[PDB]
């Protein structure tokens, strides 16, 4: 797996024509508060390509 290239799958906002996301936040997947901690309903925007 070449895990050098990634893709922001985890994001709620749709992007505007030519927009570049580069943030490293904890994607909240629901109402469960993430509070800067990775886990259930708390994943990460980027998804490494296999």
């Amino acid at each position, epitope marked *: 797996g070449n895990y050098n290239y990634l893709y922001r799958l*985890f*994001r*709620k906002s*749709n992007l505007k024509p030519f927009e570049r996301d580069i943030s490293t936040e904890i994607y909240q997947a*629901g109402s469960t508060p993430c509070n800067g901690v990775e886990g*259930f309903n708390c*994943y990460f925007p980027l*998804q490494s390509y*296999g």
Partner: antibody
Amino acid sequence: EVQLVESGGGLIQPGGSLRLSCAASGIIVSSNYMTWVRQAPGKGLEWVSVIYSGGSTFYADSVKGRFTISRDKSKNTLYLQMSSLRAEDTAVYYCARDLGPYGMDVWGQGTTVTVS
Amino acid sequence: IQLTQSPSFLSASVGDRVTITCRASQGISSDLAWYQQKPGKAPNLLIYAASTLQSGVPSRFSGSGSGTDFTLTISSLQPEDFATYYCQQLNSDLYTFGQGTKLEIK
């Protein structure tokens, strides 16, 4: 804690109209990938639709032109516009939450839809 | 893409080592999710990303394979370990499943 509850299916004449509902507790529907999944009697699971967290929609080849997926942010609920119903639409449908590399982590109980 | 499980009807007694195979026709190498379904029930994740143990799944369930080959391995059977076992294409557009393998506590 994370529960999906479904209603709206039932015995409906072929080609008729119908709608499903899928209330969600815990998960916000308006920011997660929700999919419709079908299971015909004596058959396995099969995909129907997905509406993206941004609001973009998707349906299967056997679904395009017939069904529509719809949502509500006030009630945190997922809907499926059921229309032009043929005999092959007789199945049980569940609502599941799509996370890409993570599998369908939560599921619904399912509702039986019969065509006659 | 086409996913084929092999073989469909499977039988073993308690304690046997089982190897349920879902064979990828093209080769995707990380996109598998193992779906166990009690007869007439709601499926559940078993192994996601084809090798990692999904949380709350008991440690008797294992997955292996990458690329074109993929397998489900159960180290020690239980009388309740009968179900219909699905494989799914992750990171896809149609989310293609397999036909389904019905393990039987026989």
